[PDB]
Design a protein around this nucleic acid. Structure first.
Lengths: 204, 84, 120, 50, 70
RNA sequence: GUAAGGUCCGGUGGAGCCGCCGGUAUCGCGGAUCCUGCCGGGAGUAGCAGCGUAGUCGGGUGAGAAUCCCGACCGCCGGAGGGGCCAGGGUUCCACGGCAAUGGUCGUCAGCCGUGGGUUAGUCGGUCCUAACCCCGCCCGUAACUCGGCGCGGGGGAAAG
RNA sequence: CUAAGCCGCCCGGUGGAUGGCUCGGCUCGGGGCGCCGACGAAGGGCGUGGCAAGCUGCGAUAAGCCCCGGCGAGGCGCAGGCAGCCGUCGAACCGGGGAUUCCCGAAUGGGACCUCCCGCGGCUUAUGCCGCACUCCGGGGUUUAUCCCCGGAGGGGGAACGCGGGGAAUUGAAACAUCUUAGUACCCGCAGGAAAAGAAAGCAAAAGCGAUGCCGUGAGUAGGGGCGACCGAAAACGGCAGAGGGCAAACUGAACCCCGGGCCGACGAGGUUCGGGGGAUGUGGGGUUGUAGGGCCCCCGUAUGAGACCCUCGCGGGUGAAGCCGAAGUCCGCUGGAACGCGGCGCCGGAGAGGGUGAUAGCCCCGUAGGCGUAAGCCCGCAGGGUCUCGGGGGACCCUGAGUACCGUCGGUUGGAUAUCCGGCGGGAAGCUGGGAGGCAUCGGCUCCCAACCCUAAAUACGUCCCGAGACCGAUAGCGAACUAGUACCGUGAGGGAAAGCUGAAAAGCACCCCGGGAGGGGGGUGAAAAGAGCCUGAAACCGGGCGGCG
């Protein structure tokens, strides 16, 4: 980019700047960081190192801390979630939740449990953002809601996939981002008996 | 018949030539030779050709003046073609 | 029909450069409740003879026959949805088919009947 | 110039035909968007490539 | 003209029709250059495409006859 | 607000935009006789002389005439500023309709613009012959070739011979 | 009541910044597809539209012609006009297959100062077709002329990648010559969708491994170096992917191969036969290896059985072009030019990805979540018909690659250092009772191997191209080109190479009146708003008028 132009410098003597210029009329400047149409001085490069590494043990400790914080009261409320109707924190549910594969049934179950308000809040908070992301396909900046954690999936992901801002994650593939979106811990989470047993087995 | 003739020339100079010198003016295809133009005219119009002159205009098209024999009238062929 | 890319550039490029046989399916409008109950089809492409009722625009609620259909612009002209020129002539307003409802179907076409059978 | 090969004459004829204005009906059809084309030429000022 | 009706006729009739269409096309081009009352500006296009159809079907008949004979 | 700046009020505009936290970057403009675009004083100024100092009077056209057209008179080149015709130019050729722009001023005029037309060969030239010279095949050299080359066979080579 | 002039505010002109927008760029893990040409390629010239200049597409059948299939009422490119025409006998459009396909161009019957011309033979009544370049291969004829006839090859192109050769300097060493730059830029030759390599005369020694290629690491280490600047590996180990075969000779001796025809078979596989061309200077059978392997000879047994592969007269299945189905509000009130907005009332959701629609829309439309179909081609299988392959012990006989391995010297190259590899010159063996390697040479021991012949998929390199994505750019940025862009233009030439996006929801693009030669001006209309085409916003510089201050 900016390196396809053939230029010859005028040199000393002429009442101009010693700048490389084209050999054809109208003899514009070219191939300079400060010349219109020229190369950029220090542009982005594909060889840059953007991947960051974290030790496995440190990542495990962070996941432990996130899971511990997910059951707190002050932090979950302070994050933004509305937990007025939640029976208790952490919210543990029987294994029956894992066999539901219909969004209406999941909606009714969540209404009874006391998180439908949080789902509605997430839907309201989701909206069109500001900037050039609309050009590139990031028109909406969606919000987060309750996180469904199960020990084994047999339809629950399909059932609860479509609710605004809820992720259904099998306990085995549970990561720190699932529990602390945007680096902010205290995400409202609903677990399962099997998931809690697996958490006990793994110790985190 | 044939692909020699593209279109009659309907210009005032052409009409004057038809009226005076028993000549028909055609725009024909470039690769055609004088024998080809003569044969095409004779076969299509059932007339006898006395002479053929050819030129290439500044537009790249070949124009032919075909002078018919006194036994046949060029005005009749012009009327048949609708030249008027 | 599959438009799988979730990128606005590709979506709009497909919309603008779609062939005519694909633009054909882009000029569908919803049916009325009675027609929906009768034919078990939610919507159909709109022909010229079809009766139409308008929902959105300065001519909302107006009913009339579809006068013109333009696949290139994805537009239609409906009787009565007109504008007054300065000289005093009547012209047709171009209306997107998505802002129209088909309250009566002109179904003399066996291929259209086949489409209805397939979709029902 | 007086004596010209046929191929060169044909090329000159093509350039001559190329040189002409944009049709007014084309301007109307494009809605005053298409007015001129790059191949316009003035014989005394803009010379042929050959 | 339609390909079916063209296929109906024989090769000799196809050649005769081609000759007539060529002559008429020349006549209409001359008339277009002469006058301005172009009642049917599409006659030239129709004649040209009919010529193309006639030639194509003549070639098809020739090829199929040769294949059948061989 | 010491500040880099932020925020409010009043107009225009018609479709997106921001506070806080945590990350990322082609992240902050007066210079580089910096780059691109636009616009100033010089200036209604220089130039429109020098080598051939050229127009005037009536009439016409046209909204408009020093500059276009006709007549007369006065002039200039007159071994070319006249006549014929290459290379080069490529439609500048002809008629009609025009003056937004071009023409060192004006313009009804034009090598300008728009619309139509114009180049007719047995005898004129190319085409034929060969000159200086060039190319191809075989052959030899080269790591190799689209490179260098003697000798044979073939072909080209003059629009003023 | 001060003339010019200065600063500040308002309005107007000039200009095109800013803001918002984007059918274009750039980058990328993974996925797909990768050669075209004498059956005449790619690049180019010229033509082709009713009105047609540029671009795009097509070729005298010239923005097109025909057939099968998909879609289902409009269509006639970028490109909003007049006129007309095509389509329900299914158009336009899309996927497949055909027809036409001017001239030059490897360009090829011979020539090019002009992409146009001139030739020679058979057929044809004639129109008009078929043959004729050079350098070769396999045949025939004769004239023995490379002269004629039949069949078949090479030629040119391709963005990057690949293979084989030739091969610099600026620059660094703070100068510079060994060195570095560098086996790099560039040049010549040669292939493909990949190429090259590839199966041990190898790697290593307490043990041992077992073709090649690629990655991590070994490692800035062994080692090279005016031992200066600097240059610089392999083995082992962990991974991806895995695959191994054929000749020459010993022996046999026409049991053989190709072209054309016939017959049996199914039209195929296979079998058989005739003519021609090759072949005893060896076609075919066998045989491919290291304390050995193989031929031949001898002895025991085996084959009865068990494989493997070839073909599809036939059948079944999978995959496979266009493509088809796919839920939910256009329900009341308000602002509004127009609801996608605000408040209320609802529904679907395996679908709350994304886009359009007169504002910001899960339920208006496309689509997504999830499913279906498909000619040809490809893949698998059934069934029938064929071909082909298969054991051990002993020997004293035979075979196992020559100007080759290797030695000396010279040049290049290498980390290769007295111990890398290639080449030239001069010498040059053994050859099975044999030979080679183990980092200076030679001797002995030990270990590991059998060169001087050939082939080999997958793991890999690239992206002209195609799906998909983005903490990349947002019209002086991003590719040079968001657009009639390698276009216009500059240079004899090699070659160099721009600027240029935005009316409005709908043209509703100002009907009529006065003035003017005209351009246009003033009224009056359209529009929510002139946003008036010199069209989204309209900054600054600069200029004109009014206003306030000085003068």
């Amino acid at each position: 980019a900016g390196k396809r132009r053939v230029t010859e410098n005028i040199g000393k003597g002429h009442s101009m700047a010693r700048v490389e210029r084209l050999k054809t009329p109208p003899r514009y400047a070219a191939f300079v960081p400060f010349a219109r149409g020229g190369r950029r001085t220090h542009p982005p490069k594909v060889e840059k190192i953007i991947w960051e590494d974290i030790n496995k043990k440190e990542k495990r400790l962070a996941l432990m801390s996130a899971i511990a914080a997910t059951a707190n009261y002050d932090l979950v409320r302070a994050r933004g979630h509305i937990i007025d109707n939640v029976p208790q924190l952490p919210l543990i549910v029987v294994d029956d939740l894992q066999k539901v594969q219909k969004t209406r049934e999941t909606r009714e179950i969540f209404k009874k449990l006391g998180i439908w308000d949080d789902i509605v809040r997430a839907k309201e908070k989701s909206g069109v953002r500001a900037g050039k992301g609309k050009m590139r396909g990031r028109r909406y900046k969606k919000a987060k809601g309750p996180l469904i954690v199960v020990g084994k999936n047999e339809g629950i992901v399909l059932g609860a996939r479509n609710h605004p801002g809820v992720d259904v994650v099998v306990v085995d593939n549970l990561g720190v981002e699932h529990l602390a979106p945007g680096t902010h811990p205290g995400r409202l989470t609903v677990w399962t008996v099997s998931a809690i047993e697996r958490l006990r087995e793994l110790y985190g | 018949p044939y692909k020699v003739i593209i279109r009659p020339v309907v210009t005032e100079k052409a009409i004057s030539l038809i009226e005076k010198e028993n000549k028909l003016t055609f725009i024909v295809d470039r690769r055609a030779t004088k024998q080809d133009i003569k044969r095409a005219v004779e076969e299509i119009f059932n007339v006898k050709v006395e002479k053929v002159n050819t030129l290439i205009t500044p537009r790249g098209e070949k124009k032919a003046y075909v002078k018919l024999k006194p036994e046949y009238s060029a005005s009749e062929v012009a009327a048949r073609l609708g030249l008027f | 029909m599959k438009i799988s890319s979730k990128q606005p550039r590709k979506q709009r490029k497909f919309l603008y450069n779609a062939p005519l046989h694909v633009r054909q399916k882009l000029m569908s409008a919803p049916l009325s409740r009675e027609l929906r109950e009768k034919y078990k089809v939610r919507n159909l492409p709109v022909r010229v003879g079809d009766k139409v009722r308008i929902m959105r625009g300065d001519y909302k609620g107006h009913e009339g026959k579809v006068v013109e259909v333009d696949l290139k612009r994805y537009r239609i002209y409906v009787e009565g949805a007109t504008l007054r020129k300065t000289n005093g002539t009547e012209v047709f307003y171009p209306i997107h088919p998505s802002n129209v409802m088909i309250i009566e179907l002109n179904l003399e076409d066996e291929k259209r009947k086949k489409i209805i059978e397939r979709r029902a | 110039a007086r004596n010209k090969p046929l191929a060169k004459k044909l090329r000159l004829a093509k350039a001559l035909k190329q040189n002409r204005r944009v049709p007014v009906w084309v301007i109307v059809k494009t809605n005053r968007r298409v007015l001129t084309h790059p191949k316009r030429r003035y014989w005394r000022r803009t010379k042929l490539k050959e | 003209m339609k390909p079916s009706e063209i296929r109906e006729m024989s090769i000799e009739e196809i050649d005769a029709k081609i000759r007539e269409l060529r002559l008429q096309l020349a006549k209409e081009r001359g008339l277009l250059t002469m006058g301005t009352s172009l009642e049917n500006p599409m006659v030239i296009r129709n004649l040209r495409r009919d010529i193309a159809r006639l030639l194509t079907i003549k070639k098809e008949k020739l090829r199929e006859r040769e294949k059948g004979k061989v």
